[PDB]
Amino acid sequence: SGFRKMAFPSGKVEGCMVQVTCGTTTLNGLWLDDVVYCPRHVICTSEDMLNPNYEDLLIRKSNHNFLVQAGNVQLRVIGHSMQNCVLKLKVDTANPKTPKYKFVRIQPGQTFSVLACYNGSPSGVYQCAMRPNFTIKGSFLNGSCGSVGFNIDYDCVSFCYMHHMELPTGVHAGTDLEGNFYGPFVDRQTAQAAGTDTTITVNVLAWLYAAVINGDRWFLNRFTTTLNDFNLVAMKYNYEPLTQDHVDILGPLSAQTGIAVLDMCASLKELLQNGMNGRTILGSALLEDEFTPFDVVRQCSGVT
Amino acid sequence: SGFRKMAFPSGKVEGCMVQVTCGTTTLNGLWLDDVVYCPRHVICTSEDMLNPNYEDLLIRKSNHNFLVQAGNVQLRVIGHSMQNCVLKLKVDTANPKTPKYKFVRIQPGQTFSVLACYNGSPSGVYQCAMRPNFTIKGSFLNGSCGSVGFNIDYDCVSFCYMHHMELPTGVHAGTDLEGNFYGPFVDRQTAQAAGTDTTITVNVLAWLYAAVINGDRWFLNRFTTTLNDFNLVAMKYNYEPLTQDHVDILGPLSAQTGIAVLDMCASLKELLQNGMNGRTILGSALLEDEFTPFDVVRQCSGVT
Numbered sequence A, B: 001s002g003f004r005k006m007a008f009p010s011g012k013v014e015g016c017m018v019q020v021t022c023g024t025t026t027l028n029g030l031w032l033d034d035v036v037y038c039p040r041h042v043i044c045t046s047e048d049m050l051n052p053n054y055e056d057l058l059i060r061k062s063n064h065n066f067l068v069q070a071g072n073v074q075l076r077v078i079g080h081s082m083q084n085c086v087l088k089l090k091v092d093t094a095n096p097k098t099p100k101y102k103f104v105r106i107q108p109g110q111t112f113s114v115l116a117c118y119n120g121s122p123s124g125v126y127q128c129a130m131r132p133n134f135t136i137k138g139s140f141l142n143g144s145c146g147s148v149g150f151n152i153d154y155d156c157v158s159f160c161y162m163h164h165m166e167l168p169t170g171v172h173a174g175t176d177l178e179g180n181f182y183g184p185f186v187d188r189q190t191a192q193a194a195g196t197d198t199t200i201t202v203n204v205l206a207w208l209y210a211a212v213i214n215g216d217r218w219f220l221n222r223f224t225t226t227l228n229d230f231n232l233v234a235m236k237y238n239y240e241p242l243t244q245d246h247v248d249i250l251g252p253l254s255a256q257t258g259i260a261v262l263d264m265c266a267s268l269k270e271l272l273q274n275g276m277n278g279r280t281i282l283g284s285a286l287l288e289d290e291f292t293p294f295d296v297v298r299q300c301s302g303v304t
């Protein structure tokens, strides 16, 4: 019993973190096999970040300018290339601690763990969701660039995010491990619109099922709704429209609790229209959307 | 910017987890140097848990009855002893992955990370507080016994908690690494009073300072209070009385923000008396007490 914002164990990722320095900028890199991945803005000075021409800036750099240090040991750089917004530094030594891994592009609404790092050293781990507007509400300070987001399935780490930037609004933007930004962001010191965010409906429903499993049931009502009626309410409250694909992935939670997905939608509709009335659900006074249906089943079944 | 319920990176602890089996019960153990620590109830069957005489139950067991497996490799047990509610299994091999460590008894109100494990395998990591009533509001399923709580200072892991039991109320109880229960609990299948819990005032104030640092300032008011006046309000709302020792540990956060501790107490007093009025602070609609002043400074300064 109990329900927490649980992160994946970070050990497999801690073994991949290194410090990358170029000129006077230092950030984090991810060492997998014989390649170190890091944000390409490691080649910029603060003056360059205004409107950087990364191709020209990288031309002035050579392999010996990229200082890569894995804990205490120095790595020898034998190649460098820019792929989208990431630099790939080929090193002469394969990381002996490379776990089984994949590079994945996650969908908005999906969750992942972040291992926040500074100077190649891990500082903390937390769980978060990729917002529908492709930002993340992380906890990151200067020097955290190059920290990564990931998920783990048994022995395989699927890397989905590399941290690059904090918007003027205090939210975070980054790329997949091929250097493609999630969302419309560019790696420049310019104000950039994140765009309208929405609440991840399928995740709120999954968390309501997690509440029922853990004993919080006060919000269950005698009502039902339809996808159409629920979606009129979701529109009004800035929630993502619920589809049959979302109902389908909620199937296991519906079977576990015996509560039909549309009946749980009616509970969600009532909570959106009336609020919580000073009550809480799983220690929260708001509707939580950072747990996917897969996260709820994993946490409520103990997958290792 | 951003503020998350951040856990310590769990890699150093993942390297210590093993599976311990005795008879038909399997739980987790912590392998440090040549000793494996685990809850002593690993020697019980379900029938024994009613009123176990652990001394008699352990007398029927020999070294060869304790099966300890570290991932895939089997450990040879050359000694066993019971210390309070933990068993210490001496093994013939020192754990090569033993980090620098200490065994500490944490105070109520302090925080720590839990590495939830099943069958010696890590499943997730989360941050929590030891409640004033010596329970923890964890996320644990059957088989999670032996999972540990810890803090990390640079390269040293201070182990503070070993999980033992879930109370009928769904909250969790466990011991320090010398096997002493936190709180009045006994390792028996009997209903046990946890006792009145309270909100950790110093931690709510620390989190309010974290909110100001991260830009959430709507709750700041034109008022001040005294320790005596604030404590009348704290009494009414089931908050721990604030002392000068708590004001002293809030000093760094007061210096960072320029907000006197008693002025922040007046903000807390107003939030307790009026509620949040449908507003949020750091993504929460309630007053959070799972961040200590040290946690706030660590997260807002990036200690690795």
Ligand SMILES: O=C(Cc1cccc(Cl)c1)Nc1cncc2cccnc12
Pocket (backbone or CB within 6 Å): A041, A049, A140, A141, A142, A143, A144, A145, A164, A165, A166, A167, A186, A187, A188, A189, A190, B001
């Ligand atoms: O945003 C930047 C630097 C930057 C500037 C423009 C474009 C790009 Cl790609 C990167 N770095 C940081 C990341 N996360 C959090 C922060 C907190 C404080 C200060 N810097 C932070």
Ligand SMILES: O=C(Cc1cccc(Cl)c1)Nc1cncc2cccnc12
Pocket (backbone or CB within 6 Å): A001, B041, B049, B140, B141, B142, B143, B144, B145, B164, B165, B166, B167, B186, B187, B188, B189, B190
């Ligand atoms: O509480 C027990 C077993 C037990 C019974 C009596 C005394 C003692 Cl020391 C231990 N184990 C579990 C721990 N945490 C969470 C659980 C969730 C479901 C089922 N068991 C759980």
